[PDB]
């Protein structure tokens, strides 16, 4: 097991059934977060007060308290072009699509 | 294995060594979250955009994809009253200590 961190997510929407909408983009990097949350907890991974105290209680009795978790700690948006029902053009904003940094909550 | 979920976390400080100085409070429930995050995302979980699409993969191929995880999607923080050095009372307040809600990341 290794230290929370950002790896890939490549998404793929010829996947979603929206063939007949979709135009652009039609895959992605999404990221997403894996790894181990402890001491020491690195700057990067910006702790809460709340995730130093659990990290903490879990050091000290593992079974009492689990580890915090790596997640997701800024996500920013990605807009999609697509061709509705009415025929339209759309270009559509979609938020919280890709991961910007990993830390441990 | 249960769904996502906020439990107790009892945090006691008279185990910290801030003894010559704390006066109140002496220990708080700070909770944590624990417990899957898998479909059906119900709404308290909040899920961001994300997250649904990496549930979705992780439920279509488990290898390729971790799953999500429940941590703090809202805290409140705590004051705390203690004398310092020069002797002087000091009322302090310390954000995010206190769990209000969990959800999947």
Redesign the interface.
Do not use: F, K, S, W
């Given at each position: 097991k290794a230290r929370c961190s950002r790896k890939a997510?490549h998404?793929n929407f010829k996947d979603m059934g929206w063939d007949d909408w979709i135009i652009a983009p039609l895959e992605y990097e999404?990221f997403?977060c894996?790894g181990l949350c402890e001491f020491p907890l690195r700057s990067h991974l910006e702790p809460?007060?709340?995730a130093v105290?659990?990290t903490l209680?879990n050091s000290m009795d593992p079974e009492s308290?689990?580890p915090?978790?790596?997640?997701?700690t800024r996500?920013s948006p990605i807009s999609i072009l697509f061709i509705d029902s009415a025929n339209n053009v759309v270009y559509k904003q979609?938020?919280?699509?890709?991961?910007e940094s990993c830390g441990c909550?």
């Open positions: 997510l998404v999404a997403h894996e809460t007060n709340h105290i659990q209680m308290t689990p915090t978790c790596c997640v997701p996500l979609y938020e919280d699509m890709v991961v909550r």
